[PDB]
């Protein structure tokens, strides 16, 4: 069965959050 | 009475809330990218420095109790 859940990724800087890309 | 001819002759010849929303947008610790939410981390040392704070519900639970009808606070 495939998973269905939220996956919150954590970053320190607000700036890093803004350009966050799932690929990168 | 007859009008003066001069009068007739003369008439013929003449004829910040925006920024406040921006600040509200600025203070976001959560944004969604792709299929995975992301959440902002504050520095651990900062959290140690901040005081433990209050819970809002405990005070509100008191407040609805303080404003209850039985009290007749009025």
8 Å CB contact of A9 and B39: yes
Distance of alpha carbon B16 from alpha carbon B38, whole angstroms = 30
Experimental technique, in short, is: cryo-EM
DSSP B18: H
List of chain B residues whose C-beta atoms are within 8 Å of the C-beta of residue A24: none
In angstroms, what separates the C-alpha of A24 from chain B's closest C-alpha? 11
Instruction: Name the resolution in angstroms.
Output: 4.7
8 Å CB contact of B31 and A22: no
Distance of alpha carbon B19 from alpha carbon B3, whole angstroms = 70
Distance of alpha carbon B34 from alpha carbon A21, whole angstroms = 8
Q: Is A1 exposed, middle or buried (0-12, 13-18, 19+ CB in 10 A)?
A: exposed
């Amino acid at each position: 069965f495939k998973s269905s859940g939220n996956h919150t990724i954590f970053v320190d800087s607000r700036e890093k959050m803004n350009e966050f890309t799932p690929e990168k | 009475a007859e009008l003066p001819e001069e009068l007739l002759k003369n008439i013929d010849q003449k004829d910040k809330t925006k920024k406040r929303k921006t600040l509200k947008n600025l203070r976001k610790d959560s944004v969604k990218r792709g299929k995975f939410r992301v959440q902002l981390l504050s520095t651990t040392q900062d959290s140690k420095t901040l005081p433990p704070k209050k819970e809002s519900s405990i005070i509100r639970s008191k407040d609805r109790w303080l404003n209850r009808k039985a009290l007749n606070k009025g």
